[PDB]
Design a binder for this molecule. Structure first.
Ligand SMILES: CCCCCCCCCCCCCCCCCC(=O)OC[C@H](COP(=O)([O-])OCC(O)COP(=O)([O-])OC[C@@H](COC(=O)CCCCCCCCCCCCCCCCC)OC(=O)CCCCCCCCCCCCCCCCC)OC(=O)CCCCCCCCCCCCCCCCC
Ligand SMILES: CCCCCCCCCCCCCCCCCC(=O)OC[C@H](COP(=O)([O-])OCC[N+](C)(C)C)OC(=O)CCCCCCCCCCCCCCCCC
Ligand SMILES: CCCCCCCCCCCCCCCCCC(=O)OC[C@H](COP(=O)([O-])OCC[N+](C)(C)C)OC(=O)CCCCCCCCCCCCCCCCC
Ligand SMILES: CCCCCCCCCCCCCCCCCCCC(=O)O[C@H](COC(=O)CCCCCCCCCCCCCC)COP(=O)(O)OCCN
Ligand SMILES: CCCCCCCCCCCCCCCCCCCC(=O)O[C@H](COC(=O)CCCCCCCCCCCCCC)COP(=O)(O)OCCN
Ligand code: HEC
Ligand code: HEM
Ligand code: HEM
Ligand SMILES: CCCCCCCCCCCCO[C@@H]1O[C@H](CO)[C@@H](O[C@H]2O[C@H](CO)[C@@H](O)[C@H](O)[C@H]2O)[C@H](O)[C@H]1O
Ligand SMILES: CCCCCCCCCCCCO[C@@H]1O[C@H](CO)[C@@H](O[C@H]2O[C@H](CO)[C@@H](O)[C@H](O)[C@H]2O)[C@H](O)[C@H]1O
Lengths: 244, 124, 85, 54, 71, 61, 383, 56
């Protein structure tokens, strides 16, 4: 295949979470949620994430309850069996922008924006691919590229023509912690947030892995001592042969 | 493959002057690189023995040859498990690498193959 | 072809005296540094060709094949690709 | 060494009781130690470090 | 403004200058070829994606670490 | 080479203090440490693993 | 008489794990058998636990796996343990089979454990293939489609057999629910065959790296091989830990995190890595039925090693030419693996065919020739 | 116009071809066709091109 058919391979960026002992930066996760909510959520769902999931990761219980309570969700029917709505609770999932695929495609010139809950695991490259893609729209497509109608040139996307236009521009978001919201900063934060959404066990997993590595290494060392100890009579055995 | 086969083919080669001139030097290097002598084995110690014919040949070894074979197998096993090689008198010298077993297995197989032939005789 | 303890199927053994010492009496790591350096070097040196020759050959074959494949799918390799298909 | 052997090692019942009691201690202390070390190498990054702003 | 803009410009003019010039020359050729008539009825229409990839790969190698250091 | 009463040389391996309680105690310390980490590792493994059967996060919600 | 010998139940365990007489010189490659037993135990424990949380219906399958990852306590670990141990199972089985081929474990009197072993390997492949479908991501669906359509090559009835396997006209809910039931069953069948190959082996005992009888010098399985097995168990657990906790998706395909979509076809449909050599062999033959036969033959041809090896000596420790040929055979098998996942493009098409010829010619030509010549060199060289 | 019907997971292209479209198709000499077939072999009704809409 042509390199264009593959897509350009994203750089390896130094994420805070790269590193056997490193967690996510939770301040970046919180800022990334705000980019999701103000930019991506217009077209993209995050259906695998419930409000309770944010609690103690990016937000306090009260902040997350407030986000849930602002929305309306379908309740059980009333006593005459007529439909009713209720305010959201922490158990509810974050609601998506479109009712079905057909509506989603109609709003995006035929393209279907994927759900972003697993996107960091569902693409080669992970956070680096998301960062590279969002920051990698050239002002002008390389001379000679013919884009299909409704397509935008992005070299990281296989084939080059993506149905999603550039969306991150300096100052589309105003971060609540005073961080300058440059294109690069917003892409970094939202890529971190999406990585967390794909693998929310990440921080716990790597700490448990450190404990396992330590115990297993010690047990490996002791098992070598014990094997050598038990085998030494066989290893040390000597013979004197006197032919009968 | 039967020991009979191996021995007969070898004898065809040793007969042909040309063939022996090219095969005998190769065979000698092969044996040197094989390295079984560095564990104190003789070539015949390596022959597969878990067959009726070989079990019969080993039972026909003279007692002294049999006791010496047992010692070489035990000694080589101890070198193997220790990851050491033989040194000194434990290394098999080329003059000690005698075919002590070949005559016994050739007699066992001779009878076995004659029995197969004679089981298929047709009175003419 | 295998018996059990007491009748394992060994030819009769005679004339071998075997000796050994208790695991508590021995140093389990006696001669470890010599083994780790010199014994491993000897064992590795004697087997190196059997690994190096096939690995180096098949790595070279792969390298040539992958570089040609890459070149055929560039602009420069247009014509050679057209013939290859 | 004789005393220690005689009390904790000679009887297998005592040896196993000592091993299990040690495993209990190890488990509790190792947990606390790793928790602190993990918090130091990932300082300022975890929710517990930013929670005070909210 | 976006730190990447400056870093990318600097890397193109500096360590990635050979690739920058290759891409530039490619663009010139392709644009001129598009200008010429009976281009639409040509068998092979050249693009500059290859050269672009070589340049971007180079810029990214010289910038990735620098950029994340200032975010 | 011939006499079986002349024990082969074991001096490269023999410990001088082989009959002491200190000598045995060291080897049992290694065995004991191994048993201790295996007990703590088994306990951790079993606890974390079996917890899958306790109410999941969506059920608790 | 000791109870472990007197009581018939205890005595069976005793015969296999305690008094079992072993050669005193088994090297570390004799440790893969106990690693494979460990993988089987991990896959049973993790697999039965996943079955308590997984839903086999196509509308819920992929989401039940996400529920395992997200909501079930330690579900991420049980899922990653199960998925990674499937790869480790194949690394250990290839090592164990490679040990067996290098040391002549297939020769008399061990033809029966080897032949049952070849069936174990076929059952492992089927088990792993069905388990991969259960996720119901894109690779799950499209891999099932392409692999199950190979059965269409069977003449006359092939198409009918495929529809029967699927339970419909394409891979869908009926297929997923049946693969769940069979994926749960097949590991139990595999454990029985694993036990059968050990009982068959017990008549000769283990072979050993020198290839000679060990009836002269036996060691009890316990404590010697018990404690030597612990070393490789802890080495395995360290490798397990590095993948499961630090890189849980390194051996996987990102497309399996996209839900199955019968409309969109993935860019490349490849099997899991451990099936790749067999896929390269299939591509090498242009005919559909030809390719399927070659691919099956590549596994069944292991059954003729007892015949085509003409050596009077068991194993390769003392055979320099056989060791070189074995080295080339193994590296060729790894190259076939790599070629199984490249695109069908020049020059890999021809390379795959040459590697396929080399694979088969090892069994049919080279090993019979080399083993014949080495017999003569041992005889003449030691005269 | 051309429709896309799912049938056994595979997409089905259904095109309602005009008179002049049918004509256009019946022109190409069968000789010069990787897969040599005329429209009459393909359709049972000239106004209904029904195909399995996956690229070969
Ligand atoms: C997977 C799950 C993880 C669990 C790990 C299990 C792996 C253990 C195993 O079977 O391999 C260890 C294994 C050590 O086993 P061993 O019992 O010491 O010796 C077995 C052979 O006889 C060793 O053969 P040798 O005595 O002839 O020594 C050769 C070896 C040196 O062997 C070592 O001791 C290492 O060195 C090499 O062959 C290196 C090749 C040269 C490259 C340049 O290492 C090797 O043999 C590697 C060589 C393979 C090629
Ligand atoms: C997997 C779980 C492992 C549990 C092991 C926990 C403690 C047991 C232990 O360490 O065994 C030591 C003990 C003793 O090891 P020992 O058998 O070497 O000690 C005997 C000699 N004395 C008593 C003088 C020290 O082993 C057992 O009791 C067997 C149980 C192991 C399982
Ligand atoms: C890669 C190619 C490997 C070639 C091995 C050649 C021999 C060698 O150097 O190995 C060291 C050792 C040599 O050991 P050895 O037992 O022959 O010799 C020990 C030393 N002497 C001779 C003094 C007694 O070989 C092994 O231990 C080989 C086991 C083979 C396992 C292969 C796994 C591949 C999986 C693919 C399956 C299909
Ligand atoms: C099934 C898969 C088996 C593989 C096990 C490897 C690690 C799994 C353990 C889970 C884990 O993350 O434990 C960590 C410690 O690892 C460890 O210390 C465990 C490694 C020990 C290796 C195996 C030893 C025995 C395990 C198997 C026995 C099971 C049955 C026997 C009764 C930290 O978790 P944590 O410390 O926070 O846990 C709470 C108690 N403090
Ligand atoms: C995994 C965890 C490792 C096993 C933990 C067992 C306890 C370890 C310490 C106990 C110990 O050393 O005592 C021995 C117990 O070992 C035993 O009785 C068992 C010895 C080793 C067990 C492992 C066996 C093979 C492992 C490979 C896995 C097999 C595949 C199946 C999944 C007694 O024994 P002694 O005779 O030395 O006593 C000498 C006198 N009392
Ligand atoms: C108003 C529309 C729109 C907005 C705003 C939007 N996207 Fe998208 N996005 C799309 C569409 C449409 C696609 C599908 C593109 C295609 O497949 O051709 C897409 C695709 C993607 C993909 C997958 C590309 C691939 O490899 O398949 C990622 C990742 C992505 N978007 C992330 C984001 C992030 C992160 C944001 C904002 C912070 C964002 N999107 C904002 C419309 C949008
Ligand atoms: C030899 C034993 C086994 C092997 C090699 C094996 C292999 C696999 C593989 C490759 C997968 C795909 C994993 C993934 O990528 O997500 C899988 C999934 C699964 N297996 Fe197994 N398995 C085995 C035993 C078992 C057993 C005994 C069960 C008992 C039910 C089981 C239940 C499952 C379940 C429920 C899934 C789907 C959920 C998931 O993907 O994790 N497996 N298996
Ligand atoms: C679930 C898979 C398997 C398990 C648990 C398993 C287990 C074992 C064990 C424990 C042994 C004795 C110890 C050892 O030599 O390592 C052994 C020996 C053997 N296995 Fe396997 N095995 C499996 C698969 C296979 C396969 C696929 C083959 C062959 C293709 C095979 C062929 C053999 C042979 C020939 C021996 C005897 C080797 C010898 O000691 O010389 N096994 N197996
Ligand atoms: C015969 C065996 C006896 C019965 C076995 C008992 C089965 C279940 C017992 C406890 C399982 C849950 O017990 C609970 O486990 C998890 C670890 O798994 C612990 O949880 C601890 O570690 C985990 C990760 O390791 C973190 O997510 C958590 O924040 C922390 O508190 C709880 O502190 C403990 O209360
Ligand atoms: C591997 C896990 C441990 C569980 C054991 C595996 C289950 C398989 C056991 C059933 C198969 C029957 O297994 C068979 O048992 C008898 C006694 O038990 C063994 O018999 C062997 O040991 C006994 C004493 O230990 C002797 O009387 C006998 O001469 C000897 O051959 C066979 O060599 C073995 O093949």
């Amino acid at each position: 295949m042509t390199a264009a058919e593959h897509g350009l391979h994203p750089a390896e960026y130094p994420w805070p979470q790269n590193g056997m002992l490193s967690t996510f930066d939770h301040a970046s996760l919180r800022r990334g949620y705000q980019v999701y909510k103000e930019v991506c959520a217009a077209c993209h769902s995050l259906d695998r994430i419930a409000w309770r999931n944010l609690v103690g990761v990016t937000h306090t219980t009260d902040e997350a309850k407030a986000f849930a309570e602002e929305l309306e969700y379908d309740d059980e029917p009333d006593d005459e069996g007529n439909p009713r709505k209720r305010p959201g609770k922490l158990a509810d999932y974050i609601p998506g922008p479109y009712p079905n695929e057909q509506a989603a495609r109609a709003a995006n010139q035929g393209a279907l924006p994927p759900d972003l809950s697993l996107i960091a695991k569902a693409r080669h490259g992970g956070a680096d691919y998301i960062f590279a893609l969002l920051t990698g729209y050239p002002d002008e497509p390389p001379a000679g590229v013919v884009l299909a109608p409704g397509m935008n040139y992005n070299p990281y996307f296989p084939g080059g023509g993506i149905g999603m236009a550039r969306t991150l521009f300096d100052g589309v978001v105003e971060y609540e912690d005073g961080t300058p919201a440059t294109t690069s900063q917003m892409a970094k934060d939202v890529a971190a947030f999406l990585t967390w959404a794909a693998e929310p066990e990440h921080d716990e997993r790597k700490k448990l892995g450190l404990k396992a590595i330590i115990v297993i290494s010690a047990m490996l060392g002791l098992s070598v001592y014990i094997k050598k100890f038990k085998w030494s009579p066989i290893k040390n055995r000597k013979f004197i042969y006197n032919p009968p | 493959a039967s020991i009979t086969s191996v021995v007969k083919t070898s004898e065809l080669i040793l007969k042909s002057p040309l063939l022996s001139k090219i095969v005998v030097p190769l065979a000698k290097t092969y044996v040197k690189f094989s390295g079984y002598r560095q564990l104190g084995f003789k070539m015949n110690d390596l022959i597969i023995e878990e067959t009726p014919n070989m079990q019969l040949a080993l039972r026909r070894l003279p007692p002294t040859e049999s006791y010496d074979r047992v010692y070489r197998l035990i000694r080589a096993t101890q070198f193997s498990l220790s990851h050491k090689l033989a040194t000194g008198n434990d290394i098999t010298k080329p003059e000690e690498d005698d075919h002590y077993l070949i005559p016994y297995i050739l007699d066992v197989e001779a009878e076995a193959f004659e029995k197969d032939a004679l089981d298929n005789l047709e009175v003419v | 072809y295998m018996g059990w303890w007491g009748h394992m199927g060994s030819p009769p053994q005679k004339g071998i005296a075997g000796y050994t010492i208790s695991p508590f009496a021995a140093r389990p790591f006696a001669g470890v540094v010599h083994a780790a350096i010199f014994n491993t070097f000897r064992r590795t040196k004697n087997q190196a060709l059997f690994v190096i020759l096939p690995v180096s050959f098949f790595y070279y074959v792969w390298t040539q094949a992958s570089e040609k494949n890459e070149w055929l799918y560039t602009k420069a390799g247009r014509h050679e690709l057209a013939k290859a298909l | 060494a004789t005393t220690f052997y005689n009390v904790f090692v000679k009887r297998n019942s005592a040896f196993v009781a000592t091993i299990l009691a040690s495993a209990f201690v190890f488990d509790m202390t190792f947990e606390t130690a790793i928790d602190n070390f993990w918090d130091r190498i990932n300082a300022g990054k975890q929710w517990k470090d930013i929670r005070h702003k909210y | 403004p976006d730190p990447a803009i400056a870093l990318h410009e600097a890397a193109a003019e500096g360590p990635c200058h050979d690739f920058k010039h290759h891409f530039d020359e490619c663009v010139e050729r392709v644009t001129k070829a598009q200008e010429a008539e009976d281009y639409d009825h040509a068998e092979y229409k050249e693009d500059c994606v290859e050269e672009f990839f070589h340049l971007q790969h180079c810029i990214n190698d010289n910038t990735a670490d620098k950029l994340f250091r200032v975010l | 080479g011939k006499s079986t009463y002349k024990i082969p040389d074991f001096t490269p391996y023999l410990k001088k203090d082989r009959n002491t309680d200190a000598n045995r105690l060291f080897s049992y310390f290694m065995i004991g440490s191994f048993g201790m980490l295996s007990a703590a590792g088994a306990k951790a493994t079993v606890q974390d693993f079996l917890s899958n059967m306790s109410a999941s996060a969506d059920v608790l919600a | 008489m000791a109870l472990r010998k007197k009581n018939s139940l205890l005595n069976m365990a005793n015969s296999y794990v305690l008094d079992s007489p072993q050669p005193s010189n088994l090297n570390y490659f004799w440790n893969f058998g106990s690693l494979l037993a460990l993988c089987l135990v991990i896959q049973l424990a993790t697999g039965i636990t996943l079955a308590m949380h997984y839903t086999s219906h196509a509308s819920l399958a992929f989401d039940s796996v996400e529920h395992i990852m997200r909501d079930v306590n330690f579900g991420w670990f049980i899922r990653y343990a199960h998925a990674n141990t499937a790869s480790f199972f194949f690394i250990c089985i290839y090592a164990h089979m490679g040990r067996n081929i290098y040391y002549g474990s297939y020769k008399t009197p061990r033809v029966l454990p080897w032949s049952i072993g070849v069936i174990i390997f076929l059952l492992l492949i089927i088990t792993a293939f069905m388990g991969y479908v259960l996720v119901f991501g894109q690779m799950s669906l499209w891999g099932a489609t392409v692999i199950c359509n190979l059965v269409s090559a069977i003449p006359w009835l092939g198409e009918d057999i495929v529809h029967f396997l699927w339970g419909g006209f394409s891979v869908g809910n009926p297929t997923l629910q049946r693969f769940f039931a069979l994926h749960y069953l097949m590991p139990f069948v595999l454990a029985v065959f694993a036990l059968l190959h050990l009982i068959a082996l017990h008549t000769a005992g283990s072979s050993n790296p020198l290839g000679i009888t060990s009836n002269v010098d036996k060691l009890s399985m316990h404590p010697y091989y018990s404690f030597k097995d612990l070393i490789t168990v802890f080495a395995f657990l360290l490798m397990f830990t590095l993948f499961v906790f630090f890189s849980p998706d390194k051996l996987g395909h990102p497309d399996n995190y996209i839900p199955a979509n019968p409309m969109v076809t993935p860019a490349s449909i490849v099997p899991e890595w451990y099936l790749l050599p067999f896929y390269a062999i299939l591509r090498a033959i242009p005919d559909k039925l030809g390719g399927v036969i070659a691919m099956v033959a590549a596994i069944l041809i292991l059954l003729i090693l007892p015949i085509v090896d003409r050596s009077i000596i068991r194993g390769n420790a003392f055979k320099p030419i056989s060791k070189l040929l074995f080295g080339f055979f193994i590296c060729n098998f790894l190259l076939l693996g790599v070629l199984g996942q490249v695109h069908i493009e020049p020059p890999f098409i021809v390379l795959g065919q040459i590697c396929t010829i080399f694979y088969f010619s090892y069994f049919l030509i080279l090993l019979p020739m080399v083993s014949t010549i080495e017999n003569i060199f041992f005889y003449i060289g030691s005269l | 116009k051309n429709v896309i019907i799912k049938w056994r997971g595979k997409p089905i292209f259904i095109r309602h071809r005009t008179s002049e479209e049918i004509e256009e198709a019946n022109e190409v000499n069968v000789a010069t066709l990787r897969d040599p077939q005329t429209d009459d072999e393909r359709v049972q009704k000239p106004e209904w091109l029904v195909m399995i809409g996956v690229c070969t």
